Each structure stands twice: as structure tokens, then as C-alpha cells.
Amino acid sequence: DLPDFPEHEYAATQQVGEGVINGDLYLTSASGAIQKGTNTKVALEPATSYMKAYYAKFGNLDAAKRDPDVQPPVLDPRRATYVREATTDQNGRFDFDHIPNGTYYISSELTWSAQSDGKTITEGGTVTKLVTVSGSQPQKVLLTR
């Protein structure tokens, strides 16, 4: 499962800042059609050894490829205070303000329904990337896979 919550790793992070993050969220259907993530929540949190272990198993996983017997574990309640959040607009665009200097996981979940042989298929899943912030203007994040 997950390692012990690393207090030192969270204590060493800068918790105040001026950085701006811009990006776009989308995934591709099995048919090749692009699906934009509209009015979808996007999370931005410190890139720790704790969340590296979590995102390895559940961060870039298709909903069709999920094990029904395997459920994601309950995370330490101390982690929530470090999570920043944004909702994408009508075009899948998201924005974050006052982002501190540091290294982060930027993560979202985008699923939708498709039809095939008269049966309903669940498409998409989770998508997670690394973003580094030094100065106030990092590059845009294309949150896709």
C-alpha cells in the first residue's frame, strides 16, 4: 500500500507565492474523438514520496482498466490542507493563482459514456502530470494522455 505520511517533506514546502498556472484538460476516445473536460475539478498538490506511490497505482488509469476488487486507500487527513483546486470552464481551461515555488502533481478525472453494440461503455479515467514552479510564470500544462 502507501508509505507513512512524510511530515518533513510537507514541512520543507513553501506555502505562500505569486505563481500563475494555466492549462487545458482533455482525453481521447477509443474511436479517436477528443473529449474536453468541462466544469471538471483539477487538483494541484506537493509532489511527495507519499503521493508518488498513490499516483503510480491510480493517477493515469482508464476507468475500463480498473480492478473492481481494488479500491483507492483513504489518504492521511493532514494532506488535504496542502491541496489547491480549480474547476475547468466550458472549454476545458483551468487557472491557478498565488502558486508557491516548488514541485507539484497536477491531477484530474474525466469520464464519459460511449455506445458500441447497443451496450454502454465508460471511457476516460484519471490523468496526472508533474509541474515545477521557480519564478512566477511557469509554462502551460497540457493535462492529457
Automatic annotation (TrEMBL):
Keywords: Signal. This is Carboxypeptidase regulatory-like domain-containing protein. The lineage of its organism: Bacteria, Pseudomonadati, Pseudomonadota, Gammaproteobacteria, Pseudomonadales.
